[PDB]
Design a protein around this nucleic acid. Structure first.
Ligand code: MG
Ligand code: MG
Ligand code: MG
Ligand code: MG
Ligand code: MG
Ligand code: MG
Ligand code: MG
Ligand code: MG
Ligand code: MG
Ligand code: MG
Ligand code: MG
Ligand code: MG
Ligand code: MG
Ligand code: MG
Ligand code: MG
Ligand code: MG
Ligand code: MG
Ligand code: MG
Ligand code: MG
Ligand code: MG
Ligand code: MG
Ligand code: MG
Lengths: 122, 48, 215, 114, 120
RNA sequence: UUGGCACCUCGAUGUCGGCUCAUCGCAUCCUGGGGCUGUAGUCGGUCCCAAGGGUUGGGCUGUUCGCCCAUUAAAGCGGUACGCGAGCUGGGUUCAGAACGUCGUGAGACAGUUCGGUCCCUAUCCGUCGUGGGCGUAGGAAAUUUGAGAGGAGCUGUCCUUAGUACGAGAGGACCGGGAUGGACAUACCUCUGGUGUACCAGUUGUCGUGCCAACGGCAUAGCUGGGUAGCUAUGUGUGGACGGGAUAAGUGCUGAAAGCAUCUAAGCAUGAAGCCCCCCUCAAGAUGAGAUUUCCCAACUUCGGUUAUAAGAUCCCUCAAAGAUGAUGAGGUUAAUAGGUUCGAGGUGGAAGCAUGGUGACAUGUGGAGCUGACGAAUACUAAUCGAUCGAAGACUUAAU
């Protein structure tokens, strides 16, 4: 569950460090989001140098929420923090060096570029 | 919050047609005594 | 076609093929007999009626419902049978099968069939407006004295009355409801149960009516 | 004995070959993944946090730190997608539910042996 | 279970004061709904008496109060000793029950249904 | 809308915006069906039919209004005392205080700013939501039903194929069809993920007490803390609405005269919208028009004026919950498992007391997956559902077939 005005951590080297959501896009009346959904957000904290600068309005994809996902066999997965990767709207990333583990469920979001760059996919 | 008209004698009497009371159970004390209440114990005026 | 009666037992889960997990309601459908065949000539519509669960015979000083009475005895004797508790009618079936006095066994359904289930709901008692209907509640601070009441109930003096169908509080309660397009997943013959995929209305040891899907 | 018809129906779908464990033990779970064409197996190693439920609907949960990030993972006990479970190390704890490990870090979140 | 119109801490105290005096006097008179509830409390306490070991002697002392009985022939025993001494003898063959409830009429000040509960 | 008139209301019609809850119109924002186009295609413009459903979250302002940020298929215009204060706020403004600017000789004022400033009422009638008693329905009862009528539901996107085809210089890029998956909404349910869980288990602080140790109890928000059954639950798990038939709207037509031509019309025959009626779900014979099928039961006195006892069947009374404000509903009443207890289990907690051993001691290990256990499951008449009482029919006349 990720609403508007939730802080997320950014998990690549694109320059941003923390971000907060403006809309959960999708359909009208949409309220929350999970792993594999795309949100639109503003950077609140940045690394000096880097591509993105503080105050930019970007689009991003959710990896690893805290309340995770149910799978068809009745298995679950859960993480300790919320994370996020800024995309170029091709469903391709801005940075190059995704950090931390990434959930499997965005394989079928056509995010294969993100899956290949990452460490352990569980 | 306050009644707009008084209530007549008929409308008062139609209202309390169910404001009644019922007769009790009334079994008997078969050994010795007068009537007791049903599923109770005939202690006084009763031996059951 | 394919009507049967039974009562709810509980709810479990079953691992399907390739490890998929599916929630399952188990229904015991035991000792159903055909009890009267109705006809368009005699009655005006074709149907059969089915009795579900048998009960004890006639006794002289019965004080409850688990003994049949004399009207129920003679009705359940004209078809050679024991007196039943629940009796319903099924007018979707073909009436040219089902001789009177047959036992409709539990394996008239095969795994894979789509069905509809009918029962009465749980029942909640006297309930207010935000529980019984899905109403939004008022603010809980900032000086409000409006929390769980309903809102306005009409206009001012044009329409100096309240229209009907206004959604006030009252008895939430259990009334009849059907769910559609379920499935039969596994039929057990020895225990005489049916496993259906999903959940059905009613409390435990209730009464459900299973019949085939109309769509 | 939940209800006589419930255990009679779901008896056949209940595995037998699993070892015994209680929370605080370290387990290696060989789970098998159907890929696009193959049936590749993968191992998940962690510490058992809890066990709950009864009968067919039993469930346990193991916890792992992958890349500085804690990962919980939760399974049905009798599922056919778990191939094998090994008990790597016995533990010495005093709770039935080990939820206090969620708010620890470093070497402070360690469990003794036996 | 019932609430008896009391708070959780008051209901527990009223229910073990009531169960003690049923051991002392062996038949008491009270209302209907209170006697339905002390029915199950006092019979779980005779089950502790029929076992008779130390650990259930410790467990029955969680519930009973500290009351002395002026027994006959000028002897004196506590309420706990009387439970493991005499009541455990009378019911060593019976497998439950141990109590009965006899109804009476209402009281005068209320319409409260009086009830005698006795020890059998 | 701003106004004109001054007809009700001055022995009070008592308030701008916002909240909650709605209902109607259509001069239609989206979706549906068509015509014309200066419509190649994809997009658009304009007009016609159409009111079934749907018609967003924030920043600044008391604000209506308006500007902006992001989305959406779309972010429509109006009525209902500028809908709704005996349903809520009270920021604004016609109250008493105070201050700035301006005017005034002055007391004071502006309609110009600013800070602060008390929102009453136990619902009689109509009305609405839910639930019961009485009588009736040409004998009396139990059970299953028909359905005159009424209510509900009615939304929509993205992707993949057709096909990089048609069209086009190219750039670009389809109709018509066929599949998959979502958003919002509505209903049912607790196997799962989670919440709660004040008569469940465990640890722990202070003080008083059970004569002392040891083990226990009371009070401190349930003393606090960690877990947690049943049941009640959503943020969780299932399912629903894009179907089909008939008649139509705008419109397109066939044949065809009046008017030797032509003409969709005058007579005749077709087609055509998510709108109309059916189809789906629910209530429904107090439908005084009171319906239908199956089964059960049948009296004498008699001044038949009514009395008496009664059948089938119900109820009083008692034990209860799958139901419940009460009442009704349902499970049961000794030829009995309705509740309680007892025994055995499930699940929950997590290794009791006592004893022994090791250790200076705090403590640890063993006996032993121990002991305790509310609501859940099965068995068992040990306790209690005793004995009894009440109500309850006796098939009207006319006519025609028989
Ligand atoms: Mg009167
Ligand atoms: Mg709200
Ligand atoms: Mg206390
Ligand atoms: Mg005017
Ligand atoms: Mg005037
Ligand atoms: Mg004049
Ligand atoms: Mg007046
Ligand atoms: Mg129009
Ligand atoms: Mg702010
Ligand atoms: Mg107004
Ligand atoms: Mg008003
Ligand atoms: Mg002043
Ligand atoms: Mg001056
Ligand atoms: Mg002040
Ligand atoms: Mg202020
Ligand atoms: Mg002010
Ligand atoms: Mg459960
Ligand atoms: Mg002392
Ligand atoms: Mg001590
Ligand atoms: Mg004290
Ligand atoms: Mg607690
Ligand atoms: Mg029960």
């Amino acid at each position: 569950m990720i609403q508007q005005e939730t802080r997320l951590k950014v998990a690549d080297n694109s320059g941003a460090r923390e971000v907060l959501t403006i809309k959960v896009l999708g359909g009208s009346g949409r309220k929350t989001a999970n792993i594999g959904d795309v949100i639109v957000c503003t950077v609140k904290n940045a690394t000096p140098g880097g591509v993105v600068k503080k105050g930019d309005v970007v689009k991003a994809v959710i990896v690893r929420t805290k309340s995770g996902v149910r799978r068809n066999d009745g298995s679950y997965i859960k993480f300790d923090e919320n994370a996020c990767v800024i995309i170029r709207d091709d469903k391709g990333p801005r940075g190059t060096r995704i950090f931390g583990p990434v959930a499997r469920e965005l394989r079928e979001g056509n995010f294969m570029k993100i899956v290949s760059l990452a460490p352990e996919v569980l | 919050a306050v009644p707009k008209r008084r209530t007549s004698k008929t409308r008062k009497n139609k209202r309390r047609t169910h404001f009644k009371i019922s007769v009790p159970g009334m079994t008997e004390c078969p050994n010795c005594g007068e009537y007791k209440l049903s599923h109770r114990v005939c202690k006084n005026c009763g031996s059951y | 076609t394919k009507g049967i009666l039974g009562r709810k037992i509980g709810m479990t889960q079953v691992f399907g093929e390739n490890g998929e997990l599916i929630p399952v309601t188990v229904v015991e459908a035991k000792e159903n007999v055909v009890l009267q065949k109705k006809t368009v000539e005699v009655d005006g519509y074709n149907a059969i009626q089915v009795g579900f669960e048998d009960k004890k015979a006639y006794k002289k000083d019965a004080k409850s419902n688990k003994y049949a009475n004399k009207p129920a005895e003679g009705h359940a004797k004209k078809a050679d049978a024991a007196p039943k508790r629940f009796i319903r009618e099924f007018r979707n079936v073909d009436v040219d099968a089902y001789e009177v006095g047959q036992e409709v066994s539990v394996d008239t359904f095969v795994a894979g069939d789509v069905i509809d289930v009918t029962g009465v709901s749980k029942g909640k008692g006297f309930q207010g407006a935000i529980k019984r209907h899905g109403q939004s509640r008022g603010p809980m601070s900032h000086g409000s004295h409006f929390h769980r009441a309903p809102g306005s109930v009409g206009m001012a003096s044009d329409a100096s009355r309240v229209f009907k169908g206004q959604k006030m509080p009252g008895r939430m309660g259990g009334n009849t409801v059907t769910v559609q397009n379920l499935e039969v997943v596994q039929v057990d013959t020895e225990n005489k149960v049916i496993l259906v995929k999903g959940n059905v209305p009613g409390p435990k040891k209730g009464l459900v009516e299973i019949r085939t899907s109309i769509k | 004995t939940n209800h006589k018809l419930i255990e009679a129906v779901t008896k056949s779908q209940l595995r037998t070959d699993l070892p015994s464990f209680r929370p605080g033990d370290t387990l290696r779970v060989h789970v098998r993944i159907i890929e696009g064409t193959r049936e590749r197996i993968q191992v998940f190693e962690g510490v058992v946090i809890k066990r709950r439920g009864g009968g067919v609907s039993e469930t346990f949960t193991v916890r792992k730190i992958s890349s500085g990030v804690g990962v919980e993972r939760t399974f049905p006990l009798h599922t056919p997608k778990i191939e094998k479970i090994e008990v790597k190390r016995r533990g010495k704890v005093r709770r039935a539910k080990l939820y206090y490990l969620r708010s620890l870090r470093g070497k402070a979140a360690r469990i003794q042996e036996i | 279970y019932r609430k008896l119109g009391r708070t959780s801490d008051q209901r527990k105290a009223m229910l073990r004061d009531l169960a003690t005096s049923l051991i002392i006097s062996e038949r008491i008179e009270t209302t209907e709904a209170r006697a339905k509830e002390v029915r199950s409390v006092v019979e779980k306490l005779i089950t502790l008496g029929k076992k008779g070991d130390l650990a259930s002697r410790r467990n029955a002392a969680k519930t009973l109060r500290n009351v002395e009985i002026l027994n006959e022939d000028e002897t004196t025993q506590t309420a706990l000793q009387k439970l493991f001494g005499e009541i455990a003898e009378r019911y060593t063959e019976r497998q439950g029950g141990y109590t009965r409830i006899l109804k009476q009429g209402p009281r005068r000040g209320d319409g409260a249904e009086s009830v005698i509960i006795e020890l059998v």
